[PDB]
Amino acid sequence: DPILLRPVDDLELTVRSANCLKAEAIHYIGDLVQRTEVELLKTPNLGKKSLTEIKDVLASRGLSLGMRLENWP
Amino acid sequence: FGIDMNTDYTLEEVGKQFDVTRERIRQIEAKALRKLRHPSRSEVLRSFLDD
């Protein structure tokens, strides 16, 4: 899907979440949804607020974590 | 920029307007332009550009 190869820049996330994903270095969301909640809680210096916000934005576009993809990117 | 107003006002004038130095007003303007340059909120205006 085009929206999952879309860089995180356009997710409309706060700068704290930007720093968190820079630490994780997940630029596109297609491999992001494949990651589970714990795999996002392994981020350095990340808490409940960042994950609830990222999940809220994922849901704003009808997506969430733990999904499966094939031949990505 | 003078939108929906009479003669526009300088950085100093707008800063003294509510209560602030000019530098903070410049920071606020920069933040606003950073937001508007961001996509999502920048679809119709770019259409008005038609470039």
Curated annotation (Swiss-Prot), chain A:
Residues the record lists as N6-acetyllysine modifications: K48, K49
Post-translational modification: Acetylated on Lys-48 and Lys-49 in the presence of glucose. PatZ controls acetylation of Lys-49 but not of Lys-48.
Residue positions where ADP-ribosylarginine is found in the record: R16
Coiled coil segments of this chain: none
Region (Alpha C-terminal domain (alpha-CTD)): 1-73
Domain notes: The N-terminal domain is essential for RNAP assembly and basal transcription, whereas the C-terminal domain is involved in interaction with transcriptional regulators (such as CRP) and with upstream promoter elements.
Assembly notes: Homodimer. The RNAP catalytic core consists of 2 alpha, 1 beta, 1 beta' and 1 omega subunit. When a sigma factor is associated with the core the holoenzyme is formed, which can initiate transcription. Both the N- and C-terminus interact with different regions of transcriptional regulator CRP. The rRNA transcription and antitermination complex (rrnTAC) consists of RNAP, NusA, NusB, NusE (rpsJ), NusG, SubB, ribosomal protein S4, DNA and precursor rRNA; S4 is more flexible than other subunits.
Family: Belongs to the RNA polymerase alpha chain family.
Protein role: DNA-dependent RNA polymerase (RNAP) catalyzes the transcription of DNA into RNA using the four ribonucleoside triphosphates as substrates. This subunit plays an important role in subunit assembly since its dimerization is the first step in the sequential assembly of subunits to form the holoenzyme.
Protein name, entry field: DNA-directed RNA polymerase subunit alpha
Organism: Escherichia coli (strain K12)
Gene: rpoA
Section of the entire sequence shown: 250 to 322 of 329
